[PDB]
Design a protein around this ligand. Structure first.
Ligand SMILES: C[C@H](CCC(=O)NCCC[N+](C)(C)CCCS(=O)(=O)[O-])[C@H]1CC[C@H]2[C@@H]3[C@H](O)C[C@@H]4C[C@H](O)CC[C@]4(C)[C@H]3C[C@H](O)[C@]12C
Ligand SMILES: Nc1ncnc2c1ncn2[C@@H]1O[C@H](COP(=O)(O)OP(=O)(O)O)[C@@H](O)[C@H]1O
Ligand SMILES: Nc1ncnc2c1ncn2[C@@H]1O[C@H](COP(=O)(O)OP(=O)(O)O)[C@@H](O)[C@H]1O
Ligand SMILES: [Mg+2]
Ligand SMILES: [Mg+2]
Ligand SMILES: [Mg+2]
Ligand SMILES: [Mg+2]
Lengths: 371, 370
């Protein structure tokens, strides 16, 4: 049985393929930076408590698949190994985590075009529109992600909507939280959204595409950390990303929000064009080119995306796993206020998801609720 | 793997430990074994190629079904993947329902039974009844790529275009062509196929037509779940309802009433059974929020109807026909009823989300087939 947790030294496997430091943000994952004194490398390895190290196989394979379609939008992987639960990948230390960058006031003018093309291509080319069902059904097996899905199933879709252990919210927030716990019609909709997440095996999704999962500079965008990858609903990554743009918007004031709104607008438009051009060129489906079918498919993805976004908005505000955008808002009272707005916009997104005709409708409703 | 014969079949039976005679009776080989001094079936998959792995699916699927509705599926005594054999209870004392129904048997309990079959099989293998972690494992073991590929092609694709596998009377061409030129129906057919391709909700039977049921006045056994996989809850429901309708189309006037009552009753029973199971046995913290079960039922219903429309069309002009329609006489009356199968099927797909109840479904049908 050949699994051994790495150190700085054992990490410099690198040779078997001058200085090293562990730089990991988590505690579930080690991240080793290696630099030859002018040339650098990353070695990521899954630690076990509980949560198996099989995630490393998922993450590794998923980056590889993503690389076959959008190599410019994800780090190159040089080597990986299941038993050791290691992924050896490109260093991106010359870039900034998009969430950290956004909180600091960077605007990243190309973030939405890039993320948009990422979503369109990754989401299209792993679905039944792009692949023979026989082949696609095999990939569902290899990407079955029970333990990481269970995290999302609980935290994104469940726990925040009831009085559960894992929730974490200010007492000042209680009354609004309670208003959500008492809201049957929203909960029903969230259940529907969960059930889609549980059963809708449409494409190989990234499964955790928030702003902490992106490296960015003025001119480049890299999507990292697809360890939640499995076959899920097409609109989930779309929704989760959008929600995080809005989460940042809530941490800004007045005119400074405009870039985030423009990014929400652009990521959708670009996702739609990208998905569309790929549908046109590379669908295997005899139905693909009947006028109206693509359009209805995009309506359904769009409605799901908004519902999922609602869930992320709420879930990041009062659930186990928070975002810096909200948690570092200051002073206290302003934090609570913006946190209330995340609940309220989230709630609106879930309930009104099927009424929106365009992304602009979404932006405009948000603008209105956060005055 | 060795393909069996009358003798090696007997030997297997004796070697597993269960004055013998054997005949192959398959409509896949099916070996009937009888002790003159008690009976047994041994079904084996032959290698259209098409792997023998189906026999592993079928076998495991009868076992799962047996854990919840043992009275509605044959007992399985033994099975083996490598040999692709399933050894099961003999039901020769019963009639295939489709044959029975064409002869004029009414089977008064068929819908109650199949209703409870669907309610329980379809509930107890979904995320509502099982931990997702567990459920996702079953999805792996029931992945059915080759048998799914048959259905994806024959039920949801080929009939709707001018493809190889289609098979229909020339007299029927004009109505066929009307369907092929119908963009809006085809879009709906696409959506239904996409649900069939992606919606891994439960372990479905996958081929629950009237030729996959043994029946007598008092008993009902569902056989042949070799198409089993994780798909949409409403598909078996739809496919069964459609086959009741297909029989209706082969009857005239008053004699249709039992088929309509069956459509009505199977849905009623499916609803009540699924509902009682949800009440008792859901794991879902959402399960009891008033309105959620109802909405779920509406979506199952809506899909059921869409799938049924596909089965109506597909059985009329695709590769694999049903005796109900093909044996109608005279010719001209066949064509006429075959046109109604097209037109009711088309209605079911397009109007699927408009129907308030099963009665609305029956009533629309009755209207079109006057
Ligand atoms: C007021 C702004 C326009 C500002 C602007 O365009 N600048 C807009 C454009 C999109 C609009 C929403 C959607 O249509 C969905 C939905 C339809 C229902 O029927 C009524 C409610 C709701 C939430 C609509 C409200 C309002 O109408 C919105 C927010
Ligand atoms: N390819 C890389 N290049 C440079 N730094 C990286 C790279 N991958 C991860 N890191 C650093 O290590 C941290 C952990 O990576 P991440 O994939 O977010 O781990 P986790 O899945 O544990 O959240 C990142 O936030 C980043 O700061
Ligand atoms: N358990 C059984 N008891 C009695 N006869 C059976 C049994 N299973 C199959 N048969 C006979 O053999 C035929 C083939 O059964 P079926 O499961 O439909 O095979 P296939 O999957 O090839 O269609 C049936 O129509 C039936 O007449
Ligand atoms: Mg990360
Ligand atoms: Mg991670
Ligand atoms: Mg059969
Ligand atoms: Mg069969």
């Amino acid at each position: 049985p050949l699994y051994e947790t790495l150190n700085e030294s054992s990490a410099v496997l690198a040779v078997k393929l001058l200085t090293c430091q562990e730089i990991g943000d988590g505690n579930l994952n080690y991240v080793f930076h290696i630099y030859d004194q002018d040339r650098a490398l990353i070695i990521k390895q899954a630690v076990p408590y509980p949560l198996t190290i099989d995630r490393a196989r998922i993450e590794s394979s998923a980056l590889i698949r993503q690389g076959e379609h959008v190599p410019h939008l994800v780090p190159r992987v040089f080597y990986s190994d299941t038993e050791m639960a290691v992924t050896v990948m490109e260093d991106l230390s010359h870039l900034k985590i998009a969430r950290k960058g956004l909180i600091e006031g960077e605007n990243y003018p190309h973030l939405s075009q890039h993320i948009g093309e990422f979503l369109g291509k990754t989401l299209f080319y792993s679905s039944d529109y792009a692949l023979e069902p026989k082949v696609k059904k095999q990939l569902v097996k290899q990407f079955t992600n029970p333990e990481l899905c269970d995290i999302t199933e609980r935290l994104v879709f469940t726990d925040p909507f009831f009085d559960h252990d894992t929730n974490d919210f200010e007492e000042e927030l209680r009354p609004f939280v309670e208003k959500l716990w008492n809201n049957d019609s929203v909960k029903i909709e969230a259940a529907k959204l969960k059930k889609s997440f549980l059963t809708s095996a449409e494409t190989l999704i990234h499964g955790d595409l928030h702003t902490g999962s992106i490296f960015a500079s003025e001119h480049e965008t890299k999507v990292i950390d697809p360890e939640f990858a499995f076959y899920g609903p097409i609109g989930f990554d779309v929704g989760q990303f959008i929600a995080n743009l809005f989460l940042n918007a809530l941490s800004r004031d007045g005119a400074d929000r405009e870039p985030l709104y423009e990014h929400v607008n652009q990521v959708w438009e670009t996702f739609e064009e990208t998905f569309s051009e790929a549908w046109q060129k590379d669908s295997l489906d005899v139905y693909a080119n009947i006028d109206g079918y693509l359009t209805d498919t995009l309506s359904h993805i769009f409605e799901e995306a908004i519902g999922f976004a609602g869930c992320e908005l709420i879930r990041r505000t009062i659930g186990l796993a928070h975002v810096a955008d909200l948690d570092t808002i200051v002073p206290f009272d302003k934090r609570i206020g913006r946190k209330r707005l995340a609940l309220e916009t989230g709630t609106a997104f879930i309930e009104k998801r099927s009424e929106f005709k365009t992304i602009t409708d979404v932006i405009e409703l948000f603008k209105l609720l956060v005055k």
